[PDB]
């Protein structure tokens, strides 16, 4: 049987995308720029802060100095930090707390394999810390998803090989990161987005201990 589960955060445990989007929208409006709607935010999704700010600046062809750039970057981030202060256990996606309790009582290790620089904070805010055996620091990995590095660290941090582990993800690069780590991915989304060579559920309600055991058992 599998020994660990490795959790993505955004789109699996909860939604941070929403707050990033408002952060960026609130910034673009504040400095004159139109067109930073949810549609355009699909271009900012897994992208770096600097890379995102370029793309918002390219919309109006706005010129900025290097210090003006880094202050705009900071100002978005400050906003985002303010905005995730209202995160509560009310924001934990469906079926997820229950999956954690069951994994825990079955002595299955639990690890976070998230790109969020705010993982630990977010987990305390949702009252989930007590379930998690390790949090993989995204600052301590050489390269981000789709590289496997983070899933490797999450597994190792609870003392398993990723081959002993299931990864849960909502995005294409995450699936590929789980795949290249040696872990088994179970997706949440559409096969349109994630692939048809892997097991995907339509939402997080379907991620049960029994379903993960079913999938492992091949
Ligand atoms: Mg995600």
Swiss-Prot record:
> Does the keyword field hold RNA-binding?
no
The listed locations are: Cytoplasm
What happens upon changing residue 170 to A? Impaired, but active with an increase in the affinity for G1P
Entry's induction text: By maltose, trehalose and sucrose and repressed by glucose and lactose.
Q: How does activity depend on pH?
A: Optimum pH is around 7. Relatively stable in solution within the pH range of 5-9.5.
| Inhibition and activation profile | Activated by phosphorylation. Competitively inhibited by alpha-D-galactose-1-phosphate.
Active-site residue numbers? 8, 10
Supply the Pfam families for this chain: Hydrolase
Q: Which UniProt keywords apply?
A: Carbohydrate metabolism, Cytoplasm, Isomerase, Magnesium, Metal-binding, Phosphoprotein
InterPro entries, A to Z? B-phosphoglucomutase_hydrolase, Beta-PGM, Beta-PGM-like, HAD-like_sf, HAD-SF_hydro_IA, HAD_sf, PGP-like_dom2
The entry marks the following residues as binding Mg(2+), namely 8, 10, 170
Q: What class of enzyme is it?
A: isomerase
For the site labelled Important for catalytic activity and assists the phosphoryl transfer reaction to Asp8 by balancing charge and orienting the reacting groups, the residues are 114, 145
* A molecular function GO annotation: beta-phosphoglucomutase activity
Name the protein family: Belongs to the HAD-like hydrolase superfamily. CbbY/CbbZ/Gph/YieH family.
Could you tell me what this protein does? Catalyzes the interconversion of D-glucose 1-phosphate (G1P) and D-glucose 6-phosphate (G6P), forming beta-D-glucose 1,6-(bis)phosphate (beta-G16P) as an intermediate. The beta-phosphoglucomutase (Beta-PGM) acts on the beta-C(1) anomer of G1P. Glucose or lactose are used in preference to maltose, which is only utilized after glucose or lactose has been exhausted. It plays a key role in the regulation of the flow of carbohydrate intermediates in glycolysis and the formation of the sugar nucleotide UDP-glucose.
Please give the NCBIfam families that the UniProt record associates with this protein: bPGM (TIGR01990), HAD-SF-IA-v3 (TIGR01509), PGMB-YQAB-SF (TIGR02009)
Report quaternary structure and partners.
Monomer.
Protein's name in the database: Beta-phosphoglucomutase
State which gene encodes it: pgmB
């Amino acid at each position: 049987m599998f020994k660990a589960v490795l959790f993505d955060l955004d789109g699996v445990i909860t939604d941070t995308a929403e707050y990033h989007f408002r952060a960026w929208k609130a910034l673009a409006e504040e400095i004159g720029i139109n067109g930073v709607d949810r549609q355009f935010n699909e271009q900012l999704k897994g992208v770096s802060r600097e890379d995102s700010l370029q793309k918002i600046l390219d919309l109006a062809d706005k010129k900025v100095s290097a210090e003006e750039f880094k202050e705009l970057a900071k100002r978005k981030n400050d906003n985002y930090v303010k905005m995730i202060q209202d995160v509560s256990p009310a924001d934990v996606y469906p079926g997820i707390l229950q999956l954690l309790k069951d994994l825990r009582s079955n002595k299955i290790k639990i690890a976070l394999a998230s790109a969020s620089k705010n993982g630990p904070f977010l987990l305390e805010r949702m009252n989930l810390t007590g379930y998690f055996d390790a949090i993989a620091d995204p600052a301590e990995v050489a390269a981000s998803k789709p590289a496997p590095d983070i899933f490797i660290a999450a597994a190792h941090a609870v003392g398993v090989a990723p081959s002993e582990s299931i990864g849960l993800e909502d995005s294409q690069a995450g699936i590929q990161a789980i795949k290249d780590s040696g872990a088994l991915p179970i997706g949440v989304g559409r096969p349109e987005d994630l692939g048809d060579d892997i097991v995907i559920v339509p939402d997080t309600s379907h991620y049960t201990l029994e379903f993960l055991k079913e999938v492992w058992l091949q």
